[PDB]
Paper text:
A 1.5-MDa RTX adhesin [MpAFP (Marinomonas primoryensis antifreeze protein)] with ice-binding activity was found on the surface of the Gram-negative bacterium, Marinomonas primoryensis, from Antarctica. MpAFP can be divided into five distinct Regions (RI–RV) that include the highly repetitive RII (Region II) and the moderately repetitive RIV (Region IV). RII consists of approximately 120 tandem copies of a perfect 104-aa repeat that account for over 90% of the mass of the 1.5-MDa protein. We hypothesized that MpAFP_RII serves as a Ca2+-dependent extender domain to project the ice-binding RIV away from other cell surface molecules in order to bind M. primoryensis to ice.
Author numbering: 2 to 416
The structure:
């Protein structure tokens, strides 16, 4: 008889595992054959998934044969048999045996993209800066450290899946302002070298500006004029604010004589704020600015503007009293009758029709300034007989409503 040797089979591929790519092509199965009657040229036979493969032992005790990966994927064990002869021509089979494993599939998982910024809207501030785009990746062969790729506005951003299945990557807001749809692809692999991609989709919106409205300012006081009395107290400056993104509670800011005043737009599109007359007396124009924001948090100022007029003084004139009777003496027949006491009132804001008031002997006489700047009033002679000194006071006002008194004095004698 002939004598068997030793046959061995090397790993099936470098890791002894058949993956997808290997299973799809051809695999060199190799090994050794020596000892006994094994000689160069002895045929090596392998049956693998029912297919008979054959090669011959080379000159160094080695053999190799190309096997279809599909047969190795289907059959995880096989003998390799070398057939030999001794010189006498007895025959003998030497067997070596092989095992391997098969894994021809990686498993995708699940990938998601979170809202793009807290509100899934890119605003103006966000477009101008850096936004962190985040999400999840979990399931199947997705593991910590797998690559995440996002293409956004033609820019390729990458990160890696963290230990918790989340991922984040800093992205330019510009890019997000310009491209409102994209995918995150996560690429995973298994021990065997199989690879798989898992995709998640994201959309968002862009809104970079908030819309101004219309702001108006009412008259400054009833007549749009600041008088002295008004300048000395407080004035309610009011108006309206509506349209665009203006809403109740939006701040209204007015600067007037360098003082900053603020209130808030009420529920009816109206506003009001107490301003010191003195600032209004000092500064005859101002803007009222309402600061608003849209849903996305863009902000906008709406301006309305005010003018007004200022007049805080009346001007006193000149008042005189004529001689009391032609000779400036009250006689007995004058005392017994009525005397016309007369004079002038002119200058400043004194005007035709201004009130003239005389108190003589406790009795109050009044008349008005005529067209010529003179005045006269009939007075009891007895009163002039009883009181030899008195004032005439003329009360005048201006258009703004300031008022002034002008006084002239008189004395006379009695006989
Ligand atoms: Ca023999
Ligand atoms: Ca392999
Ligand atoms: Ca068979
Ligand atoms: Ca050969
Ligand atoms: Ca088998
Ligand atoms: Ca066997
Ligand atoms: Ca032989
Ligand atoms: Ca093996
Ligand atoms: Ca697998
Ligand atoms: Ca946002
Ligand atoms: Ca890309
Ligand atoms: Ca896109
Ligand atoms: Ca892996
Ligand atoms: Ca979204
Ligand atoms: Ca907007
Ligand atoms: Ca006024
Ligand atoms: Ca001003
Ligand atoms: Ca302005
Ligand atoms: Ca708002
Ligand atoms: Ca005005
Ligand atoms: Ca005046
Ligand atoms: Ca007289
Ligand atoms: Ca008197
Ligand atoms: Ca007047
Ligand atoms: Ca006199």
């Amino acid at each position: 008889e002939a004598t068997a040797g030793t046959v061995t089979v090397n790993a099936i591929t470098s890791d002894d595992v058949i993956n997808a790519s290997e299973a799809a092509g051809t695999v060199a199965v190799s090994g050794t054959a020596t000892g006994g009657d094994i000689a160069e040229g002895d045929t090596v036979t392998l049956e693998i998934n029912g297919e008979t493969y054959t090669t011959t032992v080379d000159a160094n005790g080695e053999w190799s044969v190309d096997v279809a990966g599909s047969d190795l994927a289907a059959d995880t064990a096989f003998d390799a048999v070398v057939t030999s002869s001794d010189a006498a021509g007895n025959t003998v089979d030497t067997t070596g045996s092989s095992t391997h494993t098969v894994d021809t599939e990686a498993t995708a998982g699940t990938v998601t993209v979170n809202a793009i910024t807290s509100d899934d809207v890119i605003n103006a501030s966000e477009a101008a800066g850096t936004v962190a785009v985040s999400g999840t990746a979990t399931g199947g062969d997705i593991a910590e450290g797998d690559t995440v790729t996002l293409e956004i506005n033609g820019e390729t951003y990458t990160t890696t899946v963290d230990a918790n299945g989340e991922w984040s990557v800093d992205v330019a807001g510009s890019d997000l302002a310009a491209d409102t749809a994209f995918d995150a692809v996560v690429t995973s692999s298994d021990a065997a070298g199989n690879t798989v991609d898992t995709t998640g989709s994201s959309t968002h919106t862009v809104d970079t500006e908030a819309t101004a409205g219309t702001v108006t300012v009412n008259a400054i006081t009833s007549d749009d004029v600041i008088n002295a009395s008004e300048a000395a107290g407080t004035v309610a400056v009011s108006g309206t604010a509506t349209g665009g993104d203006i809403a109740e509670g939006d701040t209204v800011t007015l600067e007037i004589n360098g003082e900053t005043y603020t209130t808030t737009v009420d529920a009816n599109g109206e506003w009001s704020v107490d301003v010191a007359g003195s600032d209004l007396a000092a500064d005859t124009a101002f803007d009222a600015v309402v600061t608003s924001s849209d849903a996305a948090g863009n902000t906008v100022d709406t301006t309305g503007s005010s003018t007004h007029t200022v007049d805080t003084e009346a001007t006193a004139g000149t008042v005189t009293v004529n001689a009391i009777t032609s000779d400036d003496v009250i006689n007995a027949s004058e005392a017994a009758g009525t005397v016309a006491v007369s004079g002038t009132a002119t200058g400043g804001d004194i005007a035709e029709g201004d009130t003239v008031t005389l108190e003589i002997n406790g009795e109050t006489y009044t008349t008005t300034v005529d067209a010529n700047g003179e005045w006269s009033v009939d007075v009891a002679g007895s009163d002039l007989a009883a009181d030899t000194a008195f004032d005439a006071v003329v009360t005048s006002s201006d258009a703004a409503g300031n008022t002034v008194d002008t006084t002239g004095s008189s004395t006379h004698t009695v006989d």
